[PDB]
């Protein structure tokens, strides 16, 4: 049967318990200690895009030591708006976007405020007509 290999590790974090072999459809959950903040989506899904090999559906998220002083500027996406998360934007906070009518999204819809005061592991999504 199709499987995924060992999930990507996470420094200063934990990965939920999983059985072997890792079957398509398996969901893994990452988390961080109390003084750390998780940056990126917490659950990875074992999927198959070509019906032959298995891959996790996204990169593993990371744990950043908490920086109570960090703050990210308002994330703005022309053609779109926020459907989750609002100011102030602190370390570990997340924002989720949606595109206005007649606009379609490109890229990941959610971003995280990182310790270096910049948004998510990926670039802000874009909205095009």
């Amino acid at each position: 049967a199709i499987s995924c290999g060992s999930p990507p590790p996470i420094l200063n974090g934990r990965i939920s318990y999983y059985s072997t072999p890792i079957a398509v459809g398996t969901v893994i959950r990452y988390s961080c200690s109390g003084t750390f903040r998780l940056i990126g989506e917490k659950s990875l899904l074992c999927i198959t895009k070509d019906k032959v090999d298995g891959t996790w559906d996204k990169p593993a998220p990371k744990c950043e030591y908490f920086n109570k002083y960090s703050s990210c500027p308002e994330p703005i996406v022309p053609g779109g708006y926020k459907i989750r998360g609002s100011t102030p934007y602190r370390h570990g906070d997340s924002v989720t976007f949606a595109c206005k009518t007649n606009f379609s999204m490109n890229g990941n819809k959610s971003v995280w405020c990182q310790a270096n005061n910049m948004w998510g592991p990926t670039r802000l999504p874009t909205c095009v007509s």
Partner: protein
């Protein structure tokens, strides 16, 4: 049941912290809203209007001292923001928009926060930091059916700020639909007359109080004139005022009379400890009845200021 001296005692000077200030601001705001809407200043004394506008501005200005960076509110700036207080500020401020200068960044910033931070994917609004004056939230103090009761309460607030904020808050339309979907899907299961009245009004505003829902709403009334919950039925004036607003919204004029009559027999101008919601709501509802009356013969009762 109402006259000028009785209404005049509701014009008060606001003071206190983030919750206390709104308890004070409520009677004055609804009293002015009621007199303007019913066009009764001639009976009350139009020269008192200016003075009331000044107290309203004072209430508003003072409340800003408790506005947080998030645009949400709490009793004290050191305290975690209340979903309910923030929504109540929106409910009061929305009524004052053409009374004094209300900053849309303030009004709409609070609306935006409610949606972006306190509404679940399923549409339910959640309170993560309950207010200290549990006295001021009326029927919501009884935590039973809180997801439905609070969701209706916040949605009604959002509807008041919709036209003013829809431009600056793109998530507003979708938030309302989600809240509405949740209330509609779970309405039939309500047990309290209070929740039935408040969610009933919220659904009526969206044209969703129909069929079995409408029937439950109407049949829930006791003696066909009030929505009350046995054992500490202190929320009946508030519940029934929401219900009267739903009936007016539905133009269900044949069912309205016993309700207005019951409301008019209550000492609804009493004010006093814990009267914030009853006060805001009964004056909103009776003002709405009088505002609608000139267009519909069926709303013929006299619930106006008497000599």
């Amino acid at each position: 049941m109402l006259d000028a001296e009785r209404l005049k005692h509701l014009i008060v000077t606001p003071s206190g912290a983030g919750e206390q200030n709104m308890i004070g601001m409520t009677p004055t705001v609804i009293a002015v809203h009621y007199l303007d809407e019913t066009e009764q200043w001639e009976k009350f004394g139009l020269e008192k209007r200016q003075g009331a506008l000044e107290l309203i501005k004072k209430g508003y200005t003072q409340q800003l001292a408790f506005r947080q960076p998030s645009s949400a509110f709490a009793a004290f700036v050191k305290r975690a923001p209340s979903t309910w207080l923030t929504a109540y500020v929106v409910k009061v401020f929305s009524l004052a928009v053409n009374l004094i200068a209300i900053d849309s960044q303030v009004l709409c910033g609070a609306v935006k926060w409610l949606i972006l931070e306190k509404q679940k994917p399923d549409g339910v609004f959640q309170e993560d930091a309950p207010v200290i004056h549990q006295e001021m939230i009326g029927g919501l103090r009884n935590n039973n059916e809180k997801d439905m009761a609070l969701t209706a309460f916040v949605l009604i607030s959002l509807q008041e700020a919709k036209d003013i904020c829809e431009e600056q808050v793109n998530s507003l339309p979708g938030s309302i639909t989600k809240a509405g979907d949740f209330l509609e899907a779970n309405y039939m299961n309500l047990q309290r007359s209070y929740t039935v009245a408040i969610a009933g009004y919220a659904l009526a505003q969206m044209g969703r109080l129909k069929g079995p829902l409408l029937n439950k709403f109407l049949t829930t009334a006791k003696d066909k004139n009030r929505w009350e919950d046995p054992g500490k039925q202190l929320y009946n004036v508030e519940a029934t005022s929401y219900a009267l607003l739903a009936l007016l919204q539905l133009k269900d004029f044949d069912f309205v009379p016993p309700v207005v009559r019951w409301l008019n027999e209550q000492r609804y101008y009493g004010g006093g400890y814990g009267s914030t919601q009853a006060t805001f709501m009964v004056f909103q509802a009776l003002a709405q009845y009088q505002k609608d009356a000139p267009s519909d013969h069926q709303e013929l009762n006299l619930d106006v200021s008497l000599q």
